[PDB]
A paper describes a structure:
Xylanase [EC 3.2.1.8] hydrolyzes the internal β-1,4-linkage of xylan. GH10 and GH11 xylanases have two conserved catalytically important E residues in the active site.
The whole structure of WT complexed with xylobiose exhibited no difference compared to ligand-free WT13 with rmsd of 0.21 Å for 353 Cα atoms in chain A. Figure 7A shows the active-site structure of WT complexed with xylobiose, and Fig. 7B shows the comparison of WT and T315Q. R320 interacts with O5 of subsite + 1 xylose and O3 of subsite + 217, and is located near the acidic and basic catalytic residues (E150 and E256, respectively) with 8.0 and 8.8 Å, respectively.
Numbering used by the authors: 2 to 359
């Protein structure tokens, strides 16, 4: 029987000279064992949902600050670094942003002059959303996910409502506005998943390089790192981090979780007791290799955040259920559903000096 997470050496202390160790949280998790584990193992937080655009401003001028405020207060009280997730996204974004003042959907507008006005209105709404949020939290946030998931998996820019209405201008204006109100001190990140996939890595690199060349203030790349036991390779992860470091950008691992399954997560286990020990062992072997790579690149990585605390709360449960007729669980962390350490904990808390790789 494994010890509980509050009985073992701190992850954040183990990596304190190398990078932050963070967790995504909900306000209701800021009590009990989850809070105890947070304060022991992590020195950085991010809001899993409470700071997304639809959570904060679900209707225009309706500001829903309570959940986000509780996360900020917890970070203040326990002296934790705080990432802000996220200022601009095509999901969990309220639809009122994209409706003109006559009630019509901007994406449907055919008149060229009205499309140009819609672009100005949407950009101004985004500017005011950013200004309001940054002005409230600027003294508590260290790293900002300014834009999230703007690159398409099929190549090129994601053709969300943001892109259809403004082109790339929403990206430039979002960073410019975050810098304007957060100051030069604020660290501004573009965040995405599958940044290890070479075609997507290259699209992101080319977008960021072009923006940097226009003076857009981008400080780093957020690698969501929603990964698997068999994918992506350490080699492709290394190549991605190094490509963005070559532009002078910081790298953060922002939403790390390692699913037991492939994509999509078909054939999921429906009970934690059904998970074979050798799968958790394969997961431990992979986390070992992953965190050794992070150690090798520690000069280029400021922070590594897991998208959750322990296996009893992870969006990967919902993904399993979406692809297995409503049932299924996933177990992606180093702490299991009972808060007991997993094989993976032991394989990332130890200290190795000779890092092997391909
Ligand atoms: O909506 C996004 C998902 O589509 C994304 O899912 C990824 C799709 O590409 C696959 O290769 C990945 O395995 C899978 O995780 O996750 C992020 C979410 O915001
Ligand atoms: O509770 C769920 C969240 O955990 C989930 O968080 C998103 C996962 O995909 C990533 O690509 C996003 O950046 C991240 O915000 O969003 C859905 C929600 O139901
Ligand atoms: Ca830091
Ligand atoms: Ca090792
Ligand atoms: Ca570092
Ligand atoms: Ca789970
Ligand atoms: Ca190790």
């Amino acid at each position: 029987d494994q010890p509980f997470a509050w009985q073992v050496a701190s992850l954040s202390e183990r990596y304190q000279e190398q990078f932050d160790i963070g967790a995504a949280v909900e306000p209701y998790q800021l009590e009990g064992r989850q809070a105890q584990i947070l304060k022991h193992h992590y020195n950085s937080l991010v809001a899993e949902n409470a700071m997304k655009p639809e959570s904060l401003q679900p209707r225009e001028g309706e500001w829903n600050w309570e959940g986000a405020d509780k996360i900020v207060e917890f970070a203040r009280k326990h002296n934790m670094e705080l990432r802000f997730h996220t200022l601009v996204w095509h999901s969990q974004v309220p639809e009122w942003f994209f409706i003109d003042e006559d009630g019509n959907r901007m994406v449907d507008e055919t008149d060229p002059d009205k499309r140009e006005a819609n672009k100005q209105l949407l950009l101004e709404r985004m500017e005011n959303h950013i200004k309001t949020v940054v002005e409230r939290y600027k003294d508590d946030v260290t790293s900002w996910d300014v834009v999230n998931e703007v690159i398409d998996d099929g190549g090129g820019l994601r053709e969300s409502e943001w892109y259809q209405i403004t082109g790339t201008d929403y990206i430039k204006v979002a960073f410019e506005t975050a810098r304007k109100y957060g100051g030069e001190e604020a660290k501004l990140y573009i965040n995405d998943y599958n940044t290890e996939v070479p075609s997507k890595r290259d699209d992101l690199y080319n977008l960021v390089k072009d923006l940097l060349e226009q003076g857009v203030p981008i400080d780093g790349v957020g690698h969501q790192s929603h990964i698997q036991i068999g994918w992506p390779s350490i080699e492709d992860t290394r190549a991605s981090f190094e490509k963005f470091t070559s532009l002078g950008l910081d790298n953060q691992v922002t939403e790390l979780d390692m699913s037991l399954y492939g994509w999509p997560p078909t054939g999921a286990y429906t009970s934690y007791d059904d998970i074979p020990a050798e799968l958790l062992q394969a997961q431990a072997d992979r986390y070992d290799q992953l965190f050794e790579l992070y150690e090798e690149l520690a000069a280029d990585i400021s922070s590594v955040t897991f998208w959750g605390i322990a296996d009893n709360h992870t969006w990967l449960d919902g993904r399993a259920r979406e692809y297995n007729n409503g049932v299924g669980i996933d177990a992606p962390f180093v702490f299991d559903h009972n808060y007991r350490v997993k094989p993976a904990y032991w394989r990332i808390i130890d200290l190795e000096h000779h890092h092997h790789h391909h």
